[PDB]
Design a protein around this motif. Structure first.
Motif, PDB file in Angstrom:
ATOM      1  N   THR A  56       0.827  -1.205   0.000  1.00  0.00           N
ATOM      2  CA  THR A  56       0.000   0.000   0.000  1.00  0.00           C
ATOM      3  C   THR A  56       0.872   1.272   0.000  1.00  0.00           C
ATOM      4  O   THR A  56       1.887   1.323   0.674  1.00  0.00           O
ATOM      5  CB  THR A  56      -0.897  -0.031   1.234  1.00  0.00           C
ATOM      6  N   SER A  74      -3.555   9.608   2.756  1.00  0.00           N
ATOM      7  CA  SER A  74      -4.277   8.779   1.808  1.00  0.00           C
ATOM      8  C   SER A  74      -3.493   7.516   1.501  1.00  0.00           C
ATOM      9  O   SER A  74      -2.272   7.546   1.295  1.00  0.00           O
ATOM     10  CB  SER A  74      -4.540   9.534   0.513  1.00  0.00           C
ATOM     11  N   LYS A  76      -3.315   4.126  -0.962  1.00  0.00           N
ATOM     12  CA  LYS A  76      -3.832   3.365  -2.075  1.00  0.00           C
ATOM     13  C   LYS A  76      -3.004   2.128  -2.376  1.00  0.00           C
ATOM     14  O   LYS A  76      -1.794   2.131  -2.196  1.00  0.00           O
ATOM     15  CB  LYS A  76      -3.943   4.256  -3.298  1.00  0.00           C
ATOM     16  N   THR A  91      -7.700   2.245  -6.785  1.00  0.00           N
ATOM     17  CA  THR A  91      -7.220   1.472  -5.646  1.00  0.00           C
ATOM     18  C   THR A  91      -7.043   2.295  -4.357  1.00  0.00           C
ATOM     19  O   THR A  91      -6.590   1.757  -3.346  1.00  0.00           O
ATOM     20  CB  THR A  91      -5.850   0.823  -5.945  1.00  0.00           C
ATOM     21  N   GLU A  92      -7.429   3.566  -4.370  1.00  0.00           N
ATOM     22  CA  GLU A  92      -7.333   4.407  -3.188  1.00  0.00           C
ATOM     23  C   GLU A  92      -8.475   4.121  -2.227  1.00  0.00           C
ATOM     24  O   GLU A  92      -9.612   3.961  -2.660  1.00  0.00           O
ATOM     25  CB  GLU A  92      -7.346   5.867  -3.589  1.00  0.00           C
ATOM     26  N   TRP A  93      -8.177   4.011  -0.931  1.00  0.00           N
ATOM     27  CA  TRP A  93      -9.199   3.599   0.047  1.00  0.00           C
ATOM     28  C   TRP A  93     -10.265   4.681   0.279  1.00  0.00           C
ATOM     29  O   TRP A  93      -9.923   5.808   0.588  1.00  0.00           O
ATOM     30  CB  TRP A  93      -8.556   3.256   1.406  1.00  0.00           C
ATOM     31  N   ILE A 107     -12.510   0.139  -2.042  1.00  0.00           N
ATOM     32  CA  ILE A 107     -11.825   0.787  -3.144  1.00  0.00           C
ATOM     33  C   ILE A 107     -12.747   0.916  -4.361  1.00  0.00           C
ATOM     34  O   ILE A 107     -13.974   0.858  -4.219  1.00  0.00           O
ATOM     35  CB  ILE A 107     -10.449   0.095  -3.502  1.00  0.00           C
TER      36      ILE A 107
END
Length: 172
Positions: A56, A74, A76, A91-93, A107
């Motif tokens: 991550t 942030s 991802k 893919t960023e939370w 995501i």
């Protein structure tokens, strides 16, 4: 108050880490489909203790080089394997509300994605931290685990009586 990788080196801003757990029954953080999603959009903790998960990328908006606690973050996922259907998803939370499981970490592209920021918070192996979400553009909720149905899936949701205790291992 720098956040430290389990080699006692502070997290680089914009670097890739596995977020390992403390419970040795358990593995790294990754993505899995959950209910009626076909793409792997739920952020889960592996059950397989031999699994380091997906690395991550951890980033703060500030020009710090080193993530200290309480900085906004942030996270991802780096590139991983998806079916060709799901190629190119974000893919960023995100924390998306109005869900049964409580505020879920997701995501991809989600409608009810709460606005907010992640921070890291020490808990004390002994390089242990927990992750908090701070909504809405200093009360943040603890990211804990919520276990699923036919699955058994431990999915990350914002849990008051949460927390998931984690550590970080640098990706080489």
């Amino acid at each position: 108050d720098f956040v430290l990788d389990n080699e006692g080196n502070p997290l680089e801003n914009g670097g890739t880490y596995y977020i390992l757990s403390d419970i040795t029954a358990f593995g790294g953080i990754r993505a899995a489909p959950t209910g009626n999603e076909r793409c792997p959009l739920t952020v889960v903790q592996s059950r397989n203790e031999l699994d380091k998960g997906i690395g991550t990328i951890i980033s703060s908006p500030y020009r710090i080089r080193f993530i200290a606690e309480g900085h906004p973050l942030s996270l991802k996922f780096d590139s991983f394997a998806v079916i060709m259907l799901c190629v190119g998803i974000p893919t960023e939370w995100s924390v998306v509300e109005d869900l049964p499981e409580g505020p879920a970490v997701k995501i991809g592209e989600n409608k009810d994605a709460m606005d907010g920021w992640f921070r890291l918070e020490r808990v004390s192996e002994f390089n242990n931290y927990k992750l908090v979400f701070c909504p809405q553009q200093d009360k943040c909720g603890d990211i804990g685990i919520s276990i699923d149905h036919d699955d058994g899936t431990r999915r990350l949701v914002v849990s008051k009586n949460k927390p998931l205790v984690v550590q970080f291992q640098k990706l080489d």
